[PDB]
Fold Putrescine-binding periplasmic protein.
Amino acid sequence: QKTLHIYNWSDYIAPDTVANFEKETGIKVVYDVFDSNEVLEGKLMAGSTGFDLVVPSASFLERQLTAGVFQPLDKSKLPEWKNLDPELLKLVAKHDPDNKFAMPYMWATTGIGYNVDKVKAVLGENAPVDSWDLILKPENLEKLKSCGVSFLDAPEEVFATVLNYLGKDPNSTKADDYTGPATDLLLKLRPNIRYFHSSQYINDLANGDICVAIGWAGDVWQASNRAKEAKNGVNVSFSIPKEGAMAFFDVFAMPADAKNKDEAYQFLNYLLRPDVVAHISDHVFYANANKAATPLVSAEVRENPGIYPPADVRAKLFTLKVQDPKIDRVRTRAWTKVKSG
Ligand SMILES: [Cl-]
Ligand SMILES: [Cl-]
Ligand SMILES: [Cl-]
């Protein structure tokens, strides 16, 4: 029997996607999840992952390509490749030249999830929910400490966001930008942050246990929808702040030592069907990269400007660049100071 090992982000697939693929193809799927680019990259660099498909962010895949940990996708086994948005392909091609290694899957932004009522109770009806001031200004965060604050456990994203907020290059190659103002601000914020974590904030926003989080858009929209279906009265929203925000593109890639490559190609082409991936978007509240699928996704997802943002909001989004070894070391050490204490 055929078996296929997949390592994807958590909360990133419809409930029935895998079961439908199994019953159509007869392949048994082993499906596991992660919430951290650093965890996946560490697996890729330490040895065999034991997976046939993994899903890094494109900015991390750029770094991973030069280690040789992926093999190029045979485009002749991906006929539905045509369905992909060419403009998104061109953006991902900045990380994966000529799109040789990566199939764009979902994309979104790193912004602010928050409890509408709690934030307005603490900072007033005019709470600056359209601005990184909400969480990155120490006076505001000290007051939101009362109802719970979480940051992503995602150092490249947090530092780029802080740097942009401070008016620096989000991808500054100036070491002092990291050790000076970025670390200073983050250390001022630190005593107000309940935890650093990239998946617990979903149920904690849904449950009312935290009131504001740095989070990924569709994760926050999932939390909003979980509160709605529980009818617990918790109102969660998501903000792409006025100063801009990081955009990311999560992409399927094939490890160089993948065991069941024919089956992996069958799954990638399954995900390229417009009806298959639109249905995923319906359940996970993320924009997919499939331009033929967009009319098939539900109106409540397609028309949400925090999921499919319009041109003027997209014009304010930035993306990660790969840093040299000095900056990587400086950023990692500063993250360590921030996250342990
Ligand atoms: Cl996990
Ligand atoms: Cl007020
Ligand atoms: Cl706390």
Q: What stands out?
A: The pocket of chloride ion (ligand 3) is lined by residues 148, 194 (CB under 6 Å). The chain has two domains: 1-107+249-308, 108-248+309-341. The CA atoms of residues 83 and 292 lie 5 Å apart. The first helix runs from residue 17 to 25.
